[PDB]
């Protein structure tokens, strides 16, 4: 497993062809976005409520999205 | 202190006879002594094995006597070899 | 390798993996897991074991 | 036990060395006294000549604890 | 106190069977098998350690398993000779070569 820091790098990874699904995990602190790729699971931590929503709406329409 | 005559040989206790302990004393002392290194100029040469004498700091290793760095005949042989070499010329 | 090729030529199904063992009675037993989109219960009905 | 009960001669089965080794006591004394000497060389309470002389006297078993060592330092500096 | 067992069929405390105790998220203690301590690269003329390279088992240095910066040092005789050894060889190579010319002239 690997962590992603900036939002844009998560955007390109979720747009990868080998990306299969995105899991959204809600914690009491932040919101974790996990995209399952071929070799690694990439996790990005969003500490902002609206940035989580903007990320949710701006995801690629072709990728599956799951709520955890 | 701690002993009047035994010295290093007191590790053997009362065993083996007084004459044998006195015999081994000189070689026990000499083989555990620190010798002068002609290459670097320090008293850092220690016996690594019988005949092998290595300096701690400069790292030179030298073939010498069994229980002393230079045997008496080694000095005599070197002088004979040196005199033969010069007189050969 | 021969096992997964055999199940394909016999039942027209695709095996994801094959685990084999030799039983204490001396025979060989194969565990053939089918790929998703193949339903073993349907295959079991066609063969006749259910 | 902390108050000191049950610690008389009728309760001791090992030797004094087997209970608290003399080497452990000596190691604690050196570390305590060498730390104090280093603490005084820094902060300039003593100079390097005094420190070296006291370091060899500590190894020579001249001071049995801290209070003896500080008193010796004060008396040594009392010269002028 | 949660005594432990070996997890494979090696029953003897050999150097290749060394274990460590770890706590799992299951709240228990299990054995994990470690790797034997390995020397790193060594210098043949000084005997000292070669700086800049980790101390691994020989097959952990494999190219597919280790990055190139970790494997090498950027100097002639990089992972083979230390800096002091390389300086001495350069100076010896040049100074003896000058002596060869002086022998030729004289």
């Amino acid at each position: 497993p690997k962590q992603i820091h900036e939002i844009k790098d998560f955007l390109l990874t979720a747009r990868r062809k080998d990306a299969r699904s995105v899991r959204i995990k809600r914690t009491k602190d932040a919101v974790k976005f996990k995209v399952r790729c071929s070799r690694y699971l990439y996790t990005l931590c969003v500490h902002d409520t609206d940035k989580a929503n903007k990320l949710k709406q701006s995801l690629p329409p072709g990728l599956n999205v799951q709520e955890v | 202190k701690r002993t009047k005559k035994a010295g290093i040989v007191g590790k053997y206790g009362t065993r083996y006879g007084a004459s044998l302990r006195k015999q081994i004393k000189k070689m026990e002392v000499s083989q555990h002594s620190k010798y002068f290194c002609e290459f670097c100029g320090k008293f850092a040469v220690k016996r690594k094995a019988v005949g092998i004498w290595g300096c701690k700091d400069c790292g030179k290793v030298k073939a010498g006597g069994a229980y002393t760095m230079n045997t008496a005949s080694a000095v005599t042989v070197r002088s004979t070899i040196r005199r033969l070499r010069e007189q050969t010329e | 390798k021969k096992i997964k090729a055999a199940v394909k030529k016999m039942y027209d199904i695709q095996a994801k993996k094959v685990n084999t063992l030799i039983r204490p009675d001396g025979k060989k037993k194969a565990y053939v897991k089918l790929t998703p989109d193949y339903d073993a219960l349907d295959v079991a009905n066609k063969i006749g074991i259910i | 036990k902390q108050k000191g009960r049950h610690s008389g001669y009728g309760k001791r089965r090992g030797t004094r060395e087997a209970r608290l080794p003399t080497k452990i006591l000596w190691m604690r004394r050196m570390r305590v006294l060498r730390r104090l000497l280093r603490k005084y060389r820094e902060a300039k309470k003593i100079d390097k000549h005094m420190y070296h002389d006291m370091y060899l006297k500590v190894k020579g078993n001249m001071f049995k604890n801290k209070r003896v060592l500080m008193e010796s330092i004060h008396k040594s500096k009392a010269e002028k | 106190v949660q005594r432990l067992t070996y997890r494979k069929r090696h029953s003897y405390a050999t150097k290749s069977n060394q274990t460590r105790v770890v706590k799992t998220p299951g709240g228990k203690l299990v054995y994990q098998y470690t790797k034997k301590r390995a020397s790193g690269p060594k210098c043949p003329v000084t005997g000292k350690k070669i700086q800049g390279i980790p101390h691994l088992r020989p097959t952990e240095y494999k190219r597919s398993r280790l990055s190139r910066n970790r494997r090498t040092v950027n100097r002639p005789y990089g992972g083979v000779l230390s800096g002091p050894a390389v300086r001495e060889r350069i100076i010896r190579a040049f100074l003896v070569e000058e002596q060869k010319i002086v022998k030729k002239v004289l």
Binding site: - | - | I22, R23, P24, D25, G26 | - | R9
Partner: protein, 50 residues
């Protein structure tokens, strides 16, 4: 042991099959003299030296 050669396991499988009671209908045959197996072995007695 748990660690077995294949050839040892194959022989152990055959010996497992061979120590069964004789079928009951064998005793009903026309000219039958067989009473019991005469070759049953129990593991605790009569070890097979392999």
């Amino acid at each position: 042991p748990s660690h077995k050669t294949f050839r040892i396991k194959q022989k152990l499988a055959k010996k497992q099959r061979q120590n069964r009671p004789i079928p009951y209908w064998i005793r009903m045959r026309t000219d039958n003299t067989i009473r019991y197996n005469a070759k049953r072995r129990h593991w605790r007695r009569t070890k097979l030296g392999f």
